[PDB]
Design a protein around this motif. Structure first.
Motif, short mmCIF file in Angstrom:
data_model
loop_
_atom_site.label_atom_id
_atom_site.label_comp_id
_atom_site.label_asym_id
_atom_site.label_seq_id
_atom_site.Cartn_x
_atom_site.Cartn_y
_atom_site.Cartn_z
N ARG A 1 0.84 -1.22 0.00
CA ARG A 1 0.00 0.00 0.00
C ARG A 1 0.87 1.27 0.00
NH1 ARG A 1 -1.09 -3.04 4.89
NH2 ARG A 1 -3.29 -2.51 5.18
N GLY A 2 0.26 2.40 -0.23
CA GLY A 2 1.06 3.67 -0.24
C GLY A 2 0.41 4.75 -1.13
N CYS A 3 1.04 5.90 -1.20
CA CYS A 3 0.47 7.00 -2.05
C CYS A 3 0.82 6.80 -3.52
CB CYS A 3 1.04 8.35 -1.60
SG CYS A 3 0.39 9.83 -2.42
N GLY A 4 -0.16 6.97 -4.37
CA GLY A 4 0.10 6.81 -5.84
C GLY A 4 -0.85 5.77 -6.45
N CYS A 5 -0.37 5.15 -7.50
CA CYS A 5 -1.15 4.11 -8.22
C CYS A 5 -0.26 3.46 -9.29
CB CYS A 5 -2.35 4.78 -8.90
SG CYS A 5 -3.71 3.71 -9.44
N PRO A 6 0.70 2.68 -8.85
CA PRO A 6 1.65 2.00 -9.76
C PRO A 6 1.01 0.86 -10.57
CG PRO A 6 2.25 1.63 -7.36
CD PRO A 6 0.94 2.43 -7.41
N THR A 7 1.82 0.26 -11.41
CA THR A 7 1.33 -0.86 -12.26
C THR A 7 1.48 -2.19 -11.50
OG1 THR A 7 3.17 0.12 -13.36
CG2 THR A 7 1.43 -0.51 -14.79
N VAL A 8 0.90 -3.23 -12.03
CA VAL A 8 1.01 -4.55 -11.34
C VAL A 8 1.06 -5.70 -12.34
CG1 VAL A 8 -0.36 -3.54 -9.51
CG2 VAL A 8 -1.48 -4.80 -11.35
N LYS A 9 1.18 -6.89 -11.83
CA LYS A 9 1.24 -8.08 -12.72
C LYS A 9 -0.18 -8.66 -12.88
CE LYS A 9 5.71 -9.35 -10.90
NZ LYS A 9 6.13 -10.26 -12.01
N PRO A 10 -0.47 -9.26 -14.02
CA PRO A 10 -1.80 -9.84 -14.26
C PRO A 10 -2.24 -10.74 -13.10
CG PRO A 10 -0.21 -10.46 -16.08
CD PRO A 10 0.49 -9.46 -15.14
N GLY A 11 -3.38 -10.43 -12.54
CA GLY A 11 -3.90 -11.24 -11.40
C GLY A 11 -4.00 -10.40 -10.12
N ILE A 12 -2.94 -9.73 -9.79
CA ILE A 12 -2.96 -8.89 -8.56
C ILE A 12 -4.12 -7.89 -8.61
CG2 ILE A 12 -1.51 -7.43 -7.13
CD1 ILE A 12 0.86 -8.47 -8.33
N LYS A 13 -4.73 -7.63 -7.47
CA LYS A 13 -5.86 -6.67 -7.44
C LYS A 13 -5.40 -5.30 -6.96
CE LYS A 13 -9.72 -9.68 -6.74
NZ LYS A 13 -9.29 -10.44 -7.94
N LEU A 14 -5.52 -4.32 -7.82
CA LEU A 14 -5.09 -2.95 -7.45
C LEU A 14 -6.29 -2.01 -7.27
CD1 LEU A 14 -3.25 -0.73 -7.00
CD2 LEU A 14 -2.89 -0.48 -9.45
N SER A 15 -6.46 -1.54 -6.06
CA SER A 15 -7.59 -0.62 -5.78
C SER A 15 -7.04 0.78 -5.50
CB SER A 15 -8.32 -1.12 -4.52
OG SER A 15 -7.74 -2.39 -4.27
N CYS A 16 -7.28 1.70 -6.41
CA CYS A 16 -6.76 3.08 -6.21
C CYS A 16 -7.86 4.10 -5.95
CB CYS A 16 -6.01 3.50 -7.48
SG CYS A 16 -4.36 2.82 -7.75
N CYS A 17 -7.62 4.93 -4.97
CA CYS A 17 -8.61 5.98 -4.61
C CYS A 17 -7.88 7.31 -4.41
CB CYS A 17 -9.31 5.61 -3.29
SG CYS A 17 -9.05 3.96 -2.61
N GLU A 18 -8.47 8.37 -4.88
CA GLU A 18 -7.81 9.69 -4.72
C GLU A 18 -8.29 10.39 -3.45
OE1 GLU A 18 -8.31 11.78 -8.23
OE2 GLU A 18 -7.44 10.18 -9.45
N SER A 19 -8.46 9.60 -2.42
CA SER A 19 -8.92 10.16 -1.13
C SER A 19 -7.92 9.85 -0.02
CB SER A 19 -10.26 9.51 -0.78
OG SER A 19 -11.09 10.60 -0.40
N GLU A 20 -8.23 10.26 1.17
CA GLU A 20 -7.29 9.98 2.29
C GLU A 20 -7.54 8.59 2.86
OE1 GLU A 20 -8.42 12.88 5.11
OE2 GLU A 20 -10.16 11.69 5.70
N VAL A 21 -6.51 8.03 3.46
CA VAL A 21 -6.61 6.67 4.06
C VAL A 21 -7.62 5.78 3.32
CG1 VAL A 21 -5.87 7.08 6.45
CG2 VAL A 21 -8.07 7.96 5.67
N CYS A 22 -7.13 5.02 2.36
CA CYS A 22 -8.04 4.13 1.59
C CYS A 22 -7.35 2.80 1.25
CB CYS A 22 -8.41 4.81 0.26
SG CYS A 22 -7.59 4.19 -1.24
N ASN A 23 -6.25 2.51 1.92
CA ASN A 23 -5.53 1.23 1.62
C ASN A 23 -5.32 0.37 2.85
OD1 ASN A 23 -4.83 3.78 0.53
ND2 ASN A 23 -2.74 3.51 1.08
N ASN A 24 -5.83 0.80 3.94
CA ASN A 24 -5.65 0.00 5.18
C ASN A 24 -6.05 -1.46 4.94
OD1 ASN A 24 -8.09 2.38 6.02
ND2 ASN A 24 -8.43 0.65 4.74
#
Length: 62
Positions: free
Chosen positions: A39-62
């Motif tokens: 988790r962390g600030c931003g929205c990087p790329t990933v490998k096929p299969g991994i689930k990436l949830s990106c939000c432009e709000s505060e605290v959203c990856n806990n």
């Protein structure tokens, strides 16, 4: 703007998005260790299969 910066279960820590950075991402996926969660600030790329949830709000990856 805040974003969790840990993974798995250790004590949750929070990091204020750095200059330029202002998003929040949650990378959740399991592997050989078990349920892995990055988790962390931003929205990087990933490998096929991994689930990436990106939000432009505060605290959203806990």
């Amino acid at each position: 703007r805040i974003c969790f910066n840990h993974q798995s279960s250790q004590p949750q820590t929070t990091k204020t998005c750095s200059p330029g950075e202002s998003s929040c991402y949650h990378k959740q996926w399991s592997d050989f260790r078990g349920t892995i969660i990055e988790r962390g600030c931003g929205c990087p790329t990933v490998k096929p299969g991994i689930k990436l949830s990106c939000c432009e709000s505060e605290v959203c990856n806990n």
